Amino acid sequence: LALSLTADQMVSALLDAEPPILYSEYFSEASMMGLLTNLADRELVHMINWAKRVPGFVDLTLHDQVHLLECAWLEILMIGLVWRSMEHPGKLLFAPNLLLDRNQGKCVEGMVEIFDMLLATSSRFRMMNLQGEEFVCLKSIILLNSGVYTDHIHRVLDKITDTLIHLMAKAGLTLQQQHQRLAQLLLILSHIRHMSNKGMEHLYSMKCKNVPLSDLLLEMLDAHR
Amino acid sequence: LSLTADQMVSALLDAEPPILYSEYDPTRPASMMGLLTNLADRELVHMINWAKRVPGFVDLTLHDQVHLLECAWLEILMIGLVWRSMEHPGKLLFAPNLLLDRNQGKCVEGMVEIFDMLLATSSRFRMMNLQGEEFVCLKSIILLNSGVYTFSLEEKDHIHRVLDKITDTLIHLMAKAGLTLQQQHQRLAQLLLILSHIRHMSNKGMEHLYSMKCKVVPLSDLLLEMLDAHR
Amino acid sequence: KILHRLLQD
Amino acid sequence: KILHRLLQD
Ligand SMILES: CS[C@H]1CCCC(=C(c2ccc(O)cc2)c2ccc(O)cc2)C1
């Protein structure tokens, strides 16, 4: 069904599948990670249904759906965060009622490094003038690509590529400008991967050195251990 | 980067490091990690001089070149490994005399997971029928891309300028191979999505090396400095 | 796995 | 650092 869709039909479905921007509870080490854990836990529930609303993802086996989500869940939260924080330079918009800067990252050990990487990614999206239609394509790619190596998925990945190009085919971009911008967007995904892994190891650092994580988050975390 | 894609490719081809050998002896079966470490330590010395011959890399400052290598050295090693093992199904070719199996990976604890992904990556290059001209491009992309966002006020547009040049080079390669405009973007995308796996394998791998440092696998003096840059 | 249940809502 | 030296060499 995904393959039989149009580029515009692809964008429209993805735009409609978007999870909502959740709010947080209304800092220190425990105070910081406490609010982030709670926020992320509620976001995951929306992400799961978002993933089921992604074309081609439903066709996958339940196991394969599970494996893909377990692999990219932090990447998807992070690229979300990055995109929300786009029009707030130097600040991270985790939630509309929770805007954080680098100085607040020093409340938790080793989080200032991951903060700057996120701020840099957000900055690069803004400088590239990333569109919302492109963003929903990228997160869809992260979902399907990040854990396919560890066939039908590649047929869908190629469709999102065509969709991304179609978006750049509009707005009057040269063919040269199309595959360059395409390359630039996909190279960012490599960095989102890095931030996720470094984020993941910090979460496991927090799990052993006992804020309490949710059962759902604890199970997404053990898939990387 | 006042150079055509054909001149771009040839320069990267000429800059290619050799395939080194290991000290592995079939008569003798921790021990395996020692071989790979000494192998990678000698591979580094070639990579450093290889990086200098990458267009645009030497135009950068010394501190920036250091970071770009510190952050990408295992990625470049791993993609090199995956490329060599491309025509050896179910096997990793660390060296002509060192061809390893999905059974000797368990000789080191926790390495079996990394081998899987490496094998899967090798199987992906095989199915895609990856060309050497594309591999040398991807390698140089990793060198120039794996850092940057981990960084007077620079003006890193030069790196992106070279990165955009490497993109046009890849497109030029595929076009001459007979690929349609649609097939070009797809392959372009598929190739660059690989880099978002090599990163993963590198991160996982990197953390395994930091584990062994805290002991029974004494790393070389160069590898320790390349490792501490990731902590 | 909780993810199992949540993936079949 | 060795990396700085080998790059300087
Ligand atoms: C561990 S480093 C930190 C860096 C910023 C992103 C953060 C995430 C995070 C990321 C995005 C988001 O919307 C919500 C939450 C996180 C995830 C789970 C958790 O228990 C706590 C935080 C990870």
Ligand SMILES: CS[C@H]1CCCC(=C(c2ccc(O)cc2)c2ccc(O)cc2)C1
């Ligand atoms: C611990 S994970 C392991 C997985 C296979 C690749 C391996 C590498 C490796 C990778 C490629 C290569 O040509 C040579 C060496 C490695 C690097 C440094 C080191 O001290 C030991 C090994 C890393």
